[PDB]
Design a binder for this molecule. Structure first.
Ligand SMILES: CC(C)CCC[C@@H](C)CCC[C@@H](C)CCC[C@@H](C)CCOC[C@@H](CO)OCC[C@H](C)CCC[C@H](C)CCC[C@H](C)CCCC(C)C
Ligand SMILES: CC(C)CCC[C@@H](C)CCC[C@@H](C)CCC[C@@H](C)CCOC[C@@H](CO)OCC[C@H](C)CCC[C@H](C)CCC[C@H](C)CCCC(C)C
Ligand SMILES: CC(C)CCC[C@@H](C)CCC[C@@H](C)CCC[C@@H](C)CCOC[C@@H](CO)OCC[C@H](C)CCC[C@H](C)CCC[C@H](C)CCCC(C)C
Ligand SMILES: CC(C)CCC[C@@H](C)CCC[C@@H](C)CCC[C@@H](C)CCOC[C@@H](CO)OCC[C@H](C)CCC[C@H](C)CCC[C@H](C)CCCC(C)C
Ligand SMILES: CC(C)CCC[C@@H](C)CCC[C@@H](C)CCC[C@@H](C)CCOC[C@@H](CO)OCC[C@H](C)CCC[C@H](C)CCC[C@H](C)CCCC(C)C
Ligand SMILES: CC(C)CCC[C@@H](C)CCC[C@@H](C)CCC[C@@H](C)CCOC[C@@H](CO)OCC[C@H](C)CCC[C@H](C)CCC[C@H](C)CCCC(C)C
Ligand SMILES: *C/C=C(C)/C=C/C=C(C)/C=C/C1=C(C)CCCC1(C)C
Ligand SMILES: *C/C=C(C)/C=C/C=C(C)/C=C/C1=C(C)CCCC1(C)C
Ligand SMILES: *C/C=C(C)/C=C/C=C(C)/C=C/C1=C(C)CCCC1(C)C
Ligand SMILES: CCCCCCCCCCCCCCC
Ligand SMILES: CCCCCCCCCCCCCCC
Ligand SMILES: CCCCCCCCCCCCCCC
Ligand SMILES: CCCCCCCCCCCCCC
Ligand SMILES: CCCCCCCCCCCCCC
Ligand SMILES: CCCCCCCCCCCCCC
Ligand SMILES: CCCCCCCCCCCCC
Ligand SMILES: CCCCCCCCCCCCC
Ligand SMILES: CCCCCCCCCCCCC
Ligand SMILES: CCCCCCCCCCC
Ligand SMILES: CCCCCCCCCCC
Ligand SMILES: CCCCCCCCCCC
Ligand SMILES: CCCCCCCCCCC
Ligand SMILES: CCCCCCCCCC
Ligand SMILES: CCCCCCCCCC
Ligand SMILES: CCCCCCCCCC
Ligand SMILES: CCCCCCCCC
Ligand SMILES: CCCCCCCCC
Ligand SMILES: CCCCCCCCC
Ligand SMILES: CCCCCCCC
Ligand SMILES: CCCCCCCC
Ligand SMILES: CCCCCCCC
Ligand SMILES: CCCCCCCC
Ligand SMILES: CCCCCCCC
Ligand SMILES: CCCCCCCC
Ligand SMILES: CCCCCCCC
Ligand SMILES: CCCCCCCC
Ligand SMILES: CCCCCCCC
Lengths: 231, 231, 231
């Protein structure tokens, strides 16, 4: 395992998702309110899933070699198995918060599926120049999702309770900044232009992942907005 | 890319899904009605997904070689990744139209999953005779879906509004004819008996796909049945 | 096909799922009640899916070789493709019975996904000792699901009708005993410690699968609890 210089960030990533998982699980034990049970379920599953994928990467199962640029390139495919399942869960947390209509939910999830799916094709593509075509398409899907999180949700939030409006605003600004970092890291790291080496690329995705998952989860689950208005 | 004679139909297929996607996306911009937002979301995702899969085929990512009949046979596995996601979306458009009960929706989606899943196993199977066993099972699943679209939906449609009844009738006759063509093409093309060569097989699936996706979408989204009855 | 000594149990498994499928399908023909249509759809899909996976195993498609312990080990990966789809359907049958809240449903399905997903990673893992780490994690997910089926459902059941309470009790005791057998068989069979040979391991999973699927289905679908209270 220690054979790879990026092992330390995978181990740390694995540790933080595990602790994040346990904390949310224990904290959600004293919850009976049907609405809150939804947010806790969605938000505990996120780092539990990430935990398993970080572990598969640490143990070397979630890693394949991809030939391009005349080199065998280490590609951690498990990142995309992670994101495939956890990014729609995160979107669902946001969408439920503002009581999004079903059409908008299906559009967000579908676009998110396209974003992660094309990114994975981009990561596994053997023809160097074509990798960035898939990058561009995935990034376009991402921009659609961010548009809707701004110009279809923000103006839905303030028609709702103030505590769901203020919490959503914060989670929306946290999401847009963090999510936008992901295609930049990809483009400059070993999957893309290869300016930043794999061990720093792994560190960067690890910081973003823990922030996006456990950090987001902590902001959300300490808000009273997850509870129905009850006396 | 031009190495394969079927490249022209993949390129054309890619182009038409892209334009179909853009047209539906722009057209759905001026939509606020919660019901219509569902149909637009479902119906824009269909060619967006197909667009990505046609592109993966064009660039050669969605293609593998399968040994049978003592030959290496080009199999476009991405067709099934496409259909896996877009055929239930199409079914969902129909089911929502007639306000299908949940049990019937789950049965349609499940059978559709079986139909595409067994077809993919059929396409990748190394023992020639066994390929047609999977064909038969997939075709049986298909026949179940068509039965329900006739003797569980048509008699649901006319208890509803006339504009949802007339639109559903048309989309049901369009679906049954187009869908039934798919197992015939498979059986006679390179995946099956191999009487029709791959480049014509690709053309035929391309015509059916654009018709089934963009054509169906156009009939649906110009109907007033997607809107709730509003003053 | 007869090349493998376990072929007889795959053939028998295939046969029983097929007959189970046909029986449920015919029996659900005379059903109009919207609630009952849900249970019949969920419960017919279960052995139909298993039927296809048992057949893929019988024909040899659902089998790969995995190197560990310095040996090429036959691993039937199709078991997990089966379980991936059928175990949440079974959970859904239970959850609908007691009218589980949505949060609890998402938590059960998510944990079940983790349980099957980590089990599959465990089955395909090349480093012998690591296989049991994935076993432990999958088994922990399983224990979470059983906890909820006891201390979040049983006390939901008796607030409901007596016929849904008594049926759920039986299906809950049947599920907990049968499901718990699965990680034991894995640990002692060829995927784990390898004390029991593959042909007996296949027999054991076959008995459990038919019991868990067709047996469970028969108990459920002969109960009046699947029907709404109607005059
Ligand atoms: C009911 O609604 C609230 C429950 O949500 C909470 C439901 C949780 C989402 C349950 C999912 C957790 C499962 C128990 C997963 C099992 C392994 C976990 C990944 C734990 C691993 C972390 C530890 C090993 C460090
Ligand atoms: C509503 C939303 C969900 C919409 C979803 C958006 C989605 C359509 C966007 C594209 C998704 C699509 C790219 C998924 C492709 C998965 C693929 C990378 C799996 C690996 O297979 C690729 C090659 C090796 O490079 O296999 C070598 C050749 C092998 C013979 C491969 C044959 C098996 C095929 C992979 C079967 C395809 C099954 C489905 C793609 C399963 C989906 C998995 C997940 C990654 C989406
Ligand atoms: C909200 O409800 C209505 C929105 O539905 C409409 C939602 C749409 C389904 C959004 C999905 C489209 C994504 C933007 C996909 C990004 C790339 C597309 C495939 C565009 C490619 C075609 C072009 C490049 C030729
Ligand atoms: C409710 C509805 C959804 C019901 C669904 C109906 C469904 C059950 C019907 C059958 C689906 C099943 C055939 C899916 C099989 C996918 C398989 C083709 C992927 C490619 O793997 C096959 C071989 C190469 O030929 O892999 C070589 C060996 C490798 C070691 C493969 C090991 C990985 C396994 C593929 C893991 C299986 C995961 C799931 C099948 C993911 C589903 C993908 C999608 C295609 C259904
Ligand atoms: C509507 O609600 C009730 C219908 O549920 C019942 C819906 C059923 C789930 C439909 C699914 C069955 C499909 C017809 C699958 C086709 C092949 C089957 C696996 C049949 C194989 C068994 C036989 C070949 C021995
Ligand atoms: C809400 C719930 C659903 C939560 C779900 C819980 C889930 C996160 C738990 C873990 C699931 C995860 C392990 C699934 C991994 C599937 C994997 C075994 C497929 C086979 O690929 C593994 C290796 C060969 O050993 O491929 C050789 C290398 C190849 C290049 C592989 C590259 C393709 C990748 C497999 C793409 C991943 C796509 C998704 C994992 C599709 C999910 C399939 C299904 C098995 C979950
Ligand atoms: C918990 C994980 C999160 C929140 C990950 C988010 C990841 C993205 C938004 C990734 C986007 C990508 C593109 C937009 C194109 C390049 C490839 C990706 C997948 C990195
Ligand atoms: C947009 C794509 C559509 C509508 C595709 C529909 C495809 C089918 C109905 C395919 C059916 C098949 C069989 C019934 C058996 C042979 C294999 C298939 C997958 C071609
Ligand atoms: C119809 C099939 C059923 C009900 C299968 C249930 C299977 C399980 C509960 C399997 C559990 C496993 C573990 C808990 C760890 C070892 C690997 C598994 C997947 C066998
Ligand atoms: C959104 C963050 C993208 C930029 C991240 C900056 C990382 C810089 C690390 C130094 C680069 C290492 C180059 C020499 C190895
Ligand atoms: C539903 C359509 C199935 C039949 C399609 C007919 C295609 C005929 C093309 C001519 C066959 C080419 C044979 C010589 C190459
Ligand atoms: C839950 C059941 C686990 C135990 C199953 C017992 C099977 C015993 C079969 C005899 C073992 C064969 C050893 C010599 C081949
Ligand atoms: C390809 C995986 C997509 C499913 C991810 C799991 C989360 C699903 C969220 C569903 C939202 C509900 C839509 C009505
Ligand atoms: C195997 C992929 C199946 C999911 C396809 C995506 C469409 C899902 C439609 C869900 C219909 C809602 C059922 C209640
Ligand atoms: C990874 C596959 C998960 C989906 C399995 C199909 C069954 C889904 C059950 C959905 C329950 C409804 C939740 C609200
Ligand atoms: C276009 C919608 C406005 C809100 C989204 C901001 C987009 C920021 C660009 C992200 C960087 C991607 C490389
Ligand atoms: C059996 C249901 C009647 C409506 C479906 C028509 C079936 C047409 C056969 C399709 C051809 C498949 C090869
Ligand atoms: C901890 C919840 C109590 C109900 C579940 C019983 C667990 C039985 C152990 C199963 C054996 C797994 C190896
Ligand atoms: C080898 C690098 C070639 C440049 C490819 C750029 C593709 C960018 C697509 C943006 C639409
Ligand atoms: C090599 C061709 C052998 C014929 C196989 C026919 C199988 C058809 C199954 C229909 C039930
Ligand atoms: C497996 C193919 C069956 C097609 C005929 C339909 C049987 C009647 C089903 C009514 C729900
Ligand atoms: C080669 C066998 C080594 C023993 C591995 C045991 C792992 C068990 C993990 C339970 C937490
Ligand atoms: C509770 C902490 C769980 C962390 C397990 C993985 C850490 C990596 C150890 C090398
Ligand atoms: C807007 C048109 C998009 C079409 C892109 C793919 C066409 C293939 C070009 C070779
Ligand atoms: C109706 C019985 C279906 C059983 C088909 C598979 C049995 C295996 C035969 C070798
Ligand atoms: C994206 C940064 C999140 C910060 C998490 C802080 C958790 C304590 C409230
Ligand atoms: C299956 C044929 C569909 C025809 C599409 C016509 C679009 C214009 C209304
Ligand atoms: C787990 C044992 C189930 C027994 C099935 C009996 C079916 C007849 C009621
Ligand atoms: C990681 C264990 C959490 C301990 C309880 C935290 C306060 C609910
Ligand atoms: C007013 C909300 C501030 C959120 C900024 C978060 C930056 C990561
Ligand atoms: C709305 C602020 C976006 C910041 C993007 C930062 C990406 C590194
Ligand atoms: C492909 C662009 C569509 C232009 C607008 C069509 C009329 C809404
Ligand atoms: C009355 C509807 C006619 C539909 C026929 C469509 C043939 C593709
Ligand atoms: C109901 C008409 C079916 C036509 C099938 C045509 C397949 C080529
Ligand atoms: C396997 C065929 C079932 C015959 C009818 C059983 C009684 C509904
Ligand atoms: C009172 C219910 C008894 C169920 C026991 C089933 C054992 C498989
Ligand atoms: C609650 C009884 C559990 C029995 C487990 C049996 C596993 C072989």
């Amino acid at each position: 395992i220690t054979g790879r210089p990026e092992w330390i960030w995978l181990a740390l990533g694995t540790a933080l998702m595990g602790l994040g998982t346990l904390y949310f699980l224990v904290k959600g034990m004293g919850v009976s309110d049907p609405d809150a049970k939804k947010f806790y379920a969605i938000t505990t599953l996120v780092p539990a899933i990430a935990f398993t994928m970080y572990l598969s990467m640490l143990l070397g199962y979630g890693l394949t070699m991809v030939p391009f640029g005349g080199e065998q390139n280490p590609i951690y495919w498990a990142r995309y198995a992670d994101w495939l399942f956890t990014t729609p869960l995160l979107l669902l947390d946001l969408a439920l918060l503002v009581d999004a209509d079903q059409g908008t939910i299906l559009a967000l999830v579908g676009a998110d599926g396209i974003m992660i799916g094309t990114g994975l094709v981009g990561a596994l593509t053997k023809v160097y120049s074509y990798r960035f075509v898939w990058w561009a398409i995935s990034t376009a899907a991402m921009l659609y999702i961010l548009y809707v999180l701004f110009f279809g949700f923000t103006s839905k939030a303030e028609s709702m309770r103030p505590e769901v409006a203020s919490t959503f605003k914060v989670l929306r600004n946290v999401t847009v900044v963090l999510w936008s970092a992901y295609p930049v890291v990809w483009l400059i790291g070993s999957e893309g232009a290869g300016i930043v080496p794999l061990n720093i690329e792994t560190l960067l995705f690890m910081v973003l992942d823990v922030s996006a998952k456990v950090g987001f989860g902590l902001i959300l689950l300490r808000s009273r907005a997850i509870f129905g208005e009850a006396e």
